[PDB]
């Protein structure tokens, strides 16, 4: 259920979003971050992830979101559950007039870089970063840095 | 902003998953608390106490608000044992049968002293402390509560 703009605005204004964030490792002990082109956390390096839709199972969401974010569909069985997190932003997808709140389910998994097809819709660049490098940069959003604390 | 007007809550339930905390509440003898629900969804079923997280509310704050509202006893989230992520889908909703309800649920288990609760009558018309074997044997205990045991 991909909502029309009016109803997505009302939803974001009124209730927490539920999302899956992906802690994606390569063959070198590095993790995938993309530089976000959408609000919230626009212009920051952030892990790939997205919200779960109405009446969508977590199993279905994991497949839809891995395909949408990484260009590679993976089943939820590939992910290692990595906690429940909470992300609060002062802005939203279409403005700076109300806040966004996510309750986030983290999942960690390792992939082969050559099997991904990284899309350009939500990020304008992608890097595989070591925990030390990502923790040392203010350009990586705090909500992504904490996964590596 | 937090407790929504009915109009806004209806839009939310129609359009996106709710995020809730369900409480697996044990007494000193190893029995667990179930209430007979007076509201939709799962109306008329025995169910664990629990409720949804509000916009811009931390999970820590929601746990305190919800234990107080559900049990008459405020407990901190540190008292709870994380008990998994679950998903509950219902064909009806708080206002009737016009649309479905979807919850992404964070389970928490903890023991209380029965004598210290002040069980409210707003959401349940009866309460029982049941053994796992007993609650598992009854179709009047909703499947979404039975699975915790
Ligand atoms: N109109 C609309 N936009 C959405 C919906 N869900 C997500 N979006 C937007 O679609 C894009 C991708 O969604 P998602 O990956 O879930 O969002 P993220 O938290 O920004 O990474 C972002 O620009 C979101 O703001 C929806 O139901 N309706
Ligand atoms: N108007 C309104 N009602 C709500 C809201 N959140 C929950 N409710 C209703 O308030 C009561 C208690 O909420 P909760 O414990 O979260 O619901 P449960 O899932 O039915 O146990 C139920 O009747 C819900 O339908 C809200 O933001 N606005
Ligand atoms: Ca995304
Ligand atoms: Ca409740």
Short mmCIF file of N, CA and C in Angstrom, two decimals, chain A residues 1-140:
data_model
loop_
_atom_site.label_atom_id
_atom_site.label_comp_id
_atom_site.label_asym_id
_atom_site.label_seq_id
_atom_site.Cartn_x
_atom_site.Cartn_y
_atom_site.Cartn_z
N UNK A 1 0.86 -1.22 0.00
CA UNK A 1 0.00 0.00 0.00
C UNK A 1 0.88 1.25 0.00
N UNK A 2 1.23 1.73 -1.19
CA UNK A 2 2.02 2.94 -1.35
C UNK A 2 1.04 4.11 -1.41
N UNK A 3 1.01 4.85 -0.32
CA UNK A 3 0.00 5.87 -0.08
C UNK A 3 0.13 7.11 -0.94
N UNK A 4 -1.01 7.70 -1.30
CA UNK A 4 -0.98 9.01 -1.95
C UNK A 4 -0.34 10.01 -0.99
N UNK A 5 0.15 11.11 -1.55
CA UNK A 5 0.91 12.07 -0.76
C UNK A 5 0.15 12.62 0.44
N UNK A 6 -1.14 12.91 0.29
CA UNK A 6 -1.91 13.47 1.40
C UNK A 6 -1.95 12.52 2.59
N UNK A 7 -2.20 11.25 2.30
CA UNK A 7 -2.31 10.29 3.39
C UNK A 7 -0.96 9.91 3.98
N UNK A 8 0.10 9.91 3.17
CA UNK A 8 1.41 9.68 3.74
C UNK A 8 1.78 10.84 4.67
N UNK A 9 1.45 12.07 4.28
CA UNK A 9 1.69 13.22 5.15
C UNK A 9 0.94 13.06 6.47
N UNK A 10 -0.34 12.72 6.42
CA UNK A 10 -1.11 12.55 7.64
C UNK A 10 -0.53 11.43 8.51
N UNK A 11 -0.13 10.33 7.88
CA UNK A 11 0.48 9.22 8.61
C UNK A 11 1.76 9.66 9.32
N UNK A 12 2.67 10.29 8.59
CA UNK A 12 3.93 10.71 9.18
C UNK A 12 3.70 11.71 10.31
N UNK A 13 2.76 12.63 10.12
CA UNK A 13 2.41 13.59 11.16
C UNK A 13 1.85 12.95 12.43
N UNK A 14 1.17 11.82 12.25
CA UNK A 14 0.36 11.25 13.32
C UNK A 14 0.82 9.99 14.03
N UNK A 15 1.80 9.27 13.50
CA UNK A 15 2.12 7.96 14.08
C UNK A 15 3.53 7.51 13.69
N UNK A 16 4.15 6.61 14.47
CA UNK A 16 5.44 6.12 14.01
C UNK A 16 5.38 5.26 12.75
N UNK A 17 6.39 5.43 11.90
CA UNK A 17 6.61 4.52 10.79
C UNK A 17 7.32 3.30 11.38
N UNK A 18 7.23 2.17 10.69
CA UNK A 18 7.94 0.95 11.09
C UNK A 18 8.85 0.64 9.91
N UNK A 19 10.14 0.48 10.16
CA UNK A 19 11.07 0.23 9.07
C UNK A 19 12.04 -0.91 9.35
N UNK A 20 12.68 -1.35 8.28
CA UNK A 20 13.76 -2.32 8.33
C UNK A 20 15.01 -1.59 7.86
N UNK A 21 16.08 -1.64 8.65
CA UNK A 21 17.38 -1.10 8.27
C UNK A 21 18.34 -2.26 8.05
N UNK A 22 19.17 -2.15 7.02
CA UNK A 22 20.08 -3.21 6.63
C UNK A 22 21.54 -2.85 6.89
N UNK A 23 22.20 -3.69 7.69
CA UNK A 23 23.61 -3.58 8.01
C UNK A 23 24.25 -4.60 7.08
N UNK A 24 24.75 -4.11 5.94
CA UNK A 24 25.19 -4.96 4.84
C UNK A 24 26.71 -5.01 4.76
N UNK A 25 27.28 -6.19 4.92
CA UNK A 25 28.73 -6.37 4.92
C UNK A 25 29.23 -6.95 3.60
N UNK A 26 30.43 -6.55 3.19
CA UNK A 26 31.06 -7.09 1.98
C UNK A 26 32.10 -8.13 2.38
N UNK A 27 33.01 -8.47 1.48
CA UNK A 27 34.05 -9.46 1.76
C UNK A 27 35.25 -8.92 2.56
N UNK A 28 35.28 -7.61 2.77
CA UNK A 28 36.38 -6.90 3.42
C UNK A 28 36.07 -6.35 4.81
N UNK A 29 34.98 -6.77 5.44
CA UNK A 29 34.63 -6.25 6.76
C UNK A 29 34.16 -4.80 6.72
N UNK A 30 33.61 -4.39 5.58
CA UNK A 30 33.12 -3.03 5.40
C UNK A 30 31.61 -3.10 5.21
N UNK A 31 30.95 -1.97 5.47
CA UNK A 31 29.50 -1.90 5.46
C UNK A 31 28.97 -0.84 4.50
N UNK A 32 27.84 -1.15 3.88
CA UNK A 32 27.27 -0.30 2.84
C UNK A 32 26.49 0.89 3.38
N UNK A 33 26.89 2.08 2.92
CA UNK A 33 26.15 3.30 3.22
C UNK A 33 25.93 4.05 1.91
N UNK A 34 24.77 4.68 1.79
CA UNK A 34 24.46 5.52 0.64
C UNK A 34 24.24 6.94 1.10
N UNK A 35 24.51 7.91 0.23
CA UNK A 35 24.30 9.32 0.56
C UNK A 35 22.89 9.67 0.12
N UNK A 36 22.04 9.89 1.11
CA UNK A 36 20.61 10.06 0.89
C UNK A 36 20.21 11.32 0.12
N UNK A 37 19.30 11.15 -0.83
CA UNK A 37 18.77 12.28 -1.57
C UNK A 37 17.39 12.73 -1.09
N UNK A 38 16.75 11.95 -0.22
CA UNK A 38 15.45 12.33 0.34
C UNK A 38 15.54 12.65 1.82
N UNK A 39 14.64 13.52 2.28
CA UNK A 39 14.46 13.75 3.71
C UNK A 39 13.66 12.58 4.28
N UNK A 40 13.80 12.30 5.58
CA UNK A 40 14.70 12.91 6.54
C UNK A 40 16.12 12.36 6.38
N UNK A 41 17.07 12.93 7.10
CA UNK A 41 18.49 12.57 7.01
C UNK A 41 19.03 12.78 5.59
N UNK A 42 18.49 13.79 4.91
CA UNK A 42 18.91 14.10 3.55
C UNK A 42 20.34 14.62 3.55
N UNK A 43 21.14 14.14 2.60
CA UNK A 43 22.53 14.57 2.49
C UNK A 43 23.50 13.87 3.42
N UNK A 44 23.00 12.96 4.24
CA UNK A 44 23.85 12.16 5.12
C UNK A 44 24.09 10.79 4.51
N UNK A 45 25.23 10.21 4.85
CA UNK A 45 25.47 8.80 4.57
C UNK A 45 24.61 8.03 5.58
N UNK A 46 23.93 7.00 5.09
CA UNK A 46 23.00 6.23 5.92
C UNK A 46 22.92 4.81 5.39
N UNK A 47 22.61 3.86 6.27
CA UNK A 47 22.41 2.49 5.82
C UNK A 47 21.15 2.40 4.96
N UNK A 48 21.10 1.43 4.04
CA UNK A 48 19.87 1.24 3.28
C UNK A 48 18.76 0.69 4.18
N UNK A 49 17.52 1.07 3.90
CA UNK A 49 16.38 0.59 4.68
C UNK A 49 15.12 1.29 4.22
N UNK A 50 13.97 0.82 4.69
CA UNK A 50 12.72 1.46 4.29
C UNK A 50 11.56 1.00 5.15
N UNK A 51 10.42 1.67 4.98
CA UNK A 51 9.28 1.39 5.83
C UNK A 51 8.43 0.22 5.33
N UNK A 52 7.78 -0.42 6.29
CA UNK A 52 6.85 -1.51 6.06
C UNK A 52 5.48 -0.91 5.78
N UNK A 53 4.80 -1.40 4.75
CA UNK A 53 3.49 -0.89 4.35
C UNK A 53 2.34 -1.61 5.04
N UNK A 54 1.16 -0.99 4.98
CA UNK A 54 -0.06 -1.56 5.56
C UNK A 54 -0.36 -2.94 4.98
N UNK A 55 -0.62 -3.88 5.88
CA UNK A 55 -0.96 -5.27 5.57
C UNK A 55 0.15 -6.06 4.89
N UNK A 56 1.38 -5.55 4.98
CA UNK A 56 2.54 -6.22 4.42
C UNK A 56 3.24 -7.00 5.52
N UNK A 57 3.52 -8.28 5.28
CA UNK A 57 4.25 -9.06 6.27
C UNK A 57 5.71 -8.61 6.29
N UNK A 58 6.39 -8.85 7.40
CA UNK A 58 7.80 -8.49 7.51
C UNK A 58 8.62 -9.30 6.51
N UNK A 59 8.21 -10.54 6.27
CA UNK A 59 8.86 -11.41 5.29
C UNK A 59 8.77 -10.80 3.89
N UNK A 60 7.59 -10.32 3.50
CA UNK A 60 7.39 -9.69 2.20
C UNK A 60 8.13 -8.36 2.13
N UNK A 61 8.09 -7.59 3.22
CA UNK A 61 8.77 -6.30 3.24
C UNK A 61 10.28 -6.47 3.06
N UNK A 62 10.86 -7.50 3.66
CA UNK A 62 12.29 -7.73 3.56
C UNK A 62 12.68 -7.98 2.11
N UNK A 63 11.88 -8.77 1.39
CA UNK A 63 12.15 -9.04 -0.02
C UNK A 63 11.96 -7.80 -0.89
N UNK A 64 10.88 -7.06 -0.67
CA UNK A 64 10.63 -5.84 -1.44
C UNK A 64 11.73 -4.81 -1.20
N UNK A 65 12.10 -4.63 0.06
CA UNK A 65 13.08 -3.61 0.42
C UNK A 65 14.50 -3.96 0.03
N UNK A 66 14.93 -5.22 0.16
CA UNK A 66 16.26 -5.57 -0.33
C UNK A 66 16.32 -5.34 -1.84
N UNK A 67 15.29 -5.72 -2.58
CA UNK A 67 15.28 -5.48 -4.01
C UNK A 67 15.32 -3.99 -4.31
N UNK A 68 14.48 -3.21 -3.64
CA UNK A 68 14.41 -1.77 -3.89
C UNK A 68 15.67 -1.01 -3.50
N UNK A 69 16.30 -1.43 -2.40
CA UNK A 69 17.46 -0.72 -1.87
C UNK A 69 18.80 -1.18 -2.42
N UNK A 70 18.91 -2.48 -2.70
CA UNK A 70 20.17 -3.08 -3.12
C UNK A 70 20.18 -3.60 -4.56
N UNK A 71 19.01 -3.67 -5.18
CA UNK A 71 18.87 -4.26 -6.50
C UNK A 71 18.94 -5.77 -6.50
N UNK A 72 18.89 -6.38 -5.32
CA UNK A 72 18.99 -7.83 -5.13
C UNK A 72 17.96 -8.27 -4.09
N UNK A 73 17.04 -9.14 -4.50
CA UNK A 73 16.04 -9.67 -3.58
C UNK A 73 16.66 -10.75 -2.71
N UNK A 74 16.52 -10.58 -1.40
CA UNK A 74 16.98 -11.55 -0.41
C UNK A 74 15.80 -11.91 0.49
N UNK A 75 15.73 -13.17 0.95
CA UNK A 75 14.68 -13.55 1.88
C UNK A 75 15.06 -13.16 3.30
N UNK A 76 14.07 -12.98 4.18
CA UNK A 76 14.34 -12.57 5.56
C UNK A 76 15.24 -13.55 6.30
N UNK A 77 15.23 -14.82 5.89
CA UNK A 77 16.10 -15.83 6.48
C UNK A 77 17.58 -15.54 6.28
N UNK A 78 17.93 -14.68 5.32
CA UNK A 78 19.31 -14.26 5.12
C UNK A 78 19.78 -13.26 6.17
N UNK A 79 18.85 -12.58 6.82
CA UNK A 79 19.19 -11.56 7.80
C UNK A 79 19.29 -12.05 9.23
N UNK A 80 20.26 -11.52 9.96
CA UNK A 80 20.42 -11.76 11.39
C UNK A 80 19.78 -10.57 12.08
N UNK A 81 18.73 -10.80 12.85
CA UNK A 81 18.06 -9.72 13.57
C UNK A 81 19.08 -8.99 14.43
N UNK A 82 19.06 -7.66 14.36
CA UNK A 82 20.04 -6.85 15.06
C UNK A 82 19.41 -5.69 15.83
N UNK A 83 18.39 -6.02 16.62
CA UNK A 83 17.78 -5.06 17.54
C UNK A 83 16.67 -4.17 17.03
N UNK A 84 16.04 -3.51 18.00
CA UNK A 84 14.98 -2.54 17.75
C UNK A 84 15.55 -1.17 18.11
N UNK A 85 15.41 -0.24 17.18
CA UNK A 85 15.96 1.10 17.30
C UNK A 85 14.86 2.13 17.07
N UNK A 86 15.15 3.39 17.38
CA UNK A 86 14.17 4.46 17.25
C UNK A 86 14.87 5.66 16.63
N UNK A 87 14.31 6.18 15.54
CA UNK A 87 14.88 7.31 14.83
C UNK A 87 13.88 8.46 14.82
N UNK A 88 14.30 9.62 15.31
CA UNK A 88 13.46 10.82 15.38
C UNK A 88 14.10 11.94 14.58
N UNK A 89 13.34 12.54 13.68
CA UNK A 89 13.82 13.63 12.83
C UNK A 89 12.89 14.82 12.92
N UNK A 90 13.46 16.02 12.81
CA UNK A 90 12.66 17.24 12.89
C UNK A 90 11.96 17.60 11.58
N UNK A 91 12.29 16.90 10.50
CA UNK A 91 11.70 17.15 9.19
C UNK A 91 11.01 15.89 8.67
N UNK A 92 10.52 15.96 7.44
CA UNK A 92 9.80 14.86 6.82
C UNK A 92 10.05 14.81 5.32
N UNK A 93 9.56 13.73 4.71
CA UNK A 93 9.74 13.43 3.29
C UNK A 93 9.44 14.57 2.32
N UNK A 94 8.54 15.47 2.70
CA UNK A 94 8.11 16.54 1.81
C UNK A 94 8.20 17.94 2.41
N UNK A 95 8.95 18.12 3.49
CA UNK A 95 9.07 19.44 4.10
C UNK A 95 9.76 19.46 5.45
N UNK A 96 9.68 20.62 6.10
CA UNK A 96 10.28 20.84 7.41
C UNK A 96 9.23 21.25 8.43
N UNK A 97 7.97 20.98 8.12
CA UNK A 97 6.81 21.43 8.90
C UNK A 97 6.26 20.46 9.94
N UNK A 98 6.76 19.23 9.97
CA UNK A 98 6.41 18.26 11.00
C UNK A 98 7.50 17.20 11.07
N UNK A 99 7.55 16.52 12.20
CA UNK A 99 8.59 15.53 12.47
C UNK A 99 8.28 14.15 11.89
N UNK A 100 9.32 13.33 11.80
CA UNK A 100 9.21 11.93 11.40
C UNK A 100 9.74 11.05 12.53
N UNK A 101 9.05 9.94 12.78
CA UNK A 101 9.40 8.99 13.83
C UNK A 101 9.37 7.59 13.22
N UNK A 102 10.48 6.86 13.34
CA UNK A 102 10.55 5.47 12.93
C UNK A 102 10.88 4.57 14.12
N UNK A 103 10.22 3.42 14.17
CA UNK A 103 10.62 2.30 15.03
C UNK A 103 11.24 1.34 14.02
N UNK A 104 12.49 0.96 14.27
CA UNK A 104 13.31 0.29 13.28
C UNK A 104 13.77 -1.10 13.71
N UNK A 105 13.65 -2.07 12.81
CA UNK A 105 14.14 -3.42 13.03
C UNK A 105 15.41 -3.54 12.20
N UNK A 106 16.54 -3.76 12.87
CA UNK A 106 17.81 -3.91 12.17
C UNK A 106 18.05 -5.35 11.76
N UNK A 107 18.70 -5.54 10.61
CA UNK A 107 19.10 -6.85 10.13
C UNK A 107 20.50 -6.76 9.54
N UNK A 108 21.36 -7.71 9.90
CA UNK A 108 22.72 -7.76 9.39
C UNK A 108 22.88 -8.96 8.47
N UNK A 109 23.59 -8.76 7.36
CA UNK A 109 23.89 -9.86 6.44
C UNK A 109 25.06 -9.47 5.55
N UNK A 110 25.74 -10.48 5.03
CA UNK A 110 26.88 -10.30 4.14
C UNK A 110 26.47 -10.64 2.71
N UNK A 111 26.96 -9.86 1.76
CA UNK A 111 26.67 -10.06 0.35
C UNK A 111 27.95 -9.96 -0.47
N UNK A 112 27.85 -10.38 -1.72
CA UNK A 112 28.91 -10.20 -2.71
C UNK A 112 28.57 -8.90 -3.45
N UNK A 113 29.48 -7.94 -3.49
CA UNK A 113 29.25 -6.67 -4.19
C UNK A 113 28.79 -6.82 -5.63
N UNK A 114 29.38 -7.79 -6.33
CA UNK A 114 29.09 -8.03 -7.74
C UNK A 114 27.70 -8.58 -8.02
N UNK A 115 26.97 -8.93 -6.97
CA UNK A 115 25.61 -9.43 -7.09
C UNK A 115 24.57 -8.36 -6.77
N UNK A 116 25.02 -7.17 -6.38
CA UNK A 116 24.11 -6.06 -6.14
C UNK A 116 23.97 -5.23 -7.41
N UNK A 117 22.88 -4.47 -7.48
CA UNK A 117 22.65 -3.52 -8.56
C UNK A 117 22.16 -2.28 -7.85
N UNK A 118 23.10 -1.53 -7.29
CA UNK A 118 22.76 -0.39 -6.45
C UNK A 118 22.01 0.69 -7.24
N UNK A 119 20.77 1.00 -6.83
CA UNK A 119 19.92 1.96 -7.53
C UNK A 119 20.25 3.41 -7.21
N UNK A 120 19.82 4.33 -8.07
CA UNK A 120 20.10 5.75 -7.86
C UNK A 120 18.91 6.59 -7.41
N UNK A 121 17.78 5.96 -7.11
CA UNK A 121 16.59 6.70 -6.71
C UNK A 121 16.71 7.42 -5.37
N UNK A 122 17.27 6.73 -4.37
CA UNK A 122 17.33 7.26 -3.01
C UNK A 122 18.72 7.69 -2.54
N UNK A 123 19.75 7.38 -3.31
CA UNK A 123 21.12 7.74 -2.95
C UNK A 123 21.88 8.18 -4.19
N UNK A 124 22.74 9.19 -4.03
CA UNK A 124 23.54 9.71 -5.13
C UNK A 124 24.98 9.20 -5.13
N UNK A 125 25.32 8.34 -4.18
CA UNK A 125 26.63 7.71 -4.10
C UNK A 125 26.52 6.60 -3.06
N UNK A 126 27.41 5.62 -3.15
CA UNK A 126 27.48 4.51 -2.21
C UNK A 126 28.93 4.18 -1.90
N UNK A 127 29.20 3.84 -0.64
CA UNK A 127 30.52 3.43 -0.19
C UNK A 127 30.41 2.27 0.78
N UNK A 128 31.47 1.47 0.81
CA UNK A 128 31.62 0.39 1.77
C UNK A 128 32.66 0.91 2.75
N UNK A 129 32.24 1.13 3.99
CA UNK A 129 33.08 1.77 4.99
C UNK A 129 33.38 0.87 6.18
N UNK A 130 34.59 1.00 6.73
CA UNK A 130 34.91 0.26 7.94
C UNK A 130 34.18 0.92 9.11
N UNK A 131 33.89 0.15 10.17
CA UNK A 131 33.32 0.77 11.36
C UNK A 131 34.10 1.99 11.86
N UNK A 132 35.43 1.93 11.90
CA UNK A 132 36.21 3.08 12.34
C UNK A 132 36.02 4.32 11.48
N UNK A 133 35.99 4.14 10.16
CA UNK A 133 35.82 5.27 9.26
C UNK A 133 34.44 5.90 9.41
N UNK A 134 33.41 5.07 9.47
CA UNK A 134 32.06 5.60 9.54
C UNK A 134 31.81 6.28 10.89
N UNK A 135 32.39 5.74 11.96
CA UNK A 135 32.26 6.35 13.27
C UNK A 135 32.98 7.69 13.40
N UNK A 136 33.99 7.91 12.57
CA UNK A 136 34.79 9.14 12.62
C UNK A 136 34.23 10.31 11.81
N UNK A 137 33.13 10.10 11.10
CA UNK A 137 32.58 11.14 10.24
C UNK A 137 31.21 11.67 10.65
N UNK A 138 31.12 12.98 10.82
CA UNK A 138 29.84 13.63 11.09
C UNK A 138 28.90 13.59 9.89
N UNK A 139 29.41 13.26 8.70
CA UNK A 139 28.56 13.12 7.53
C UNK A 139 27.80 11.80 7.49
N UNK A 140 28.13 10.87 8.38
CA UNK A 140 27.35 9.65 8.56
C UNK A 140 26.38 10.00 9.68
#
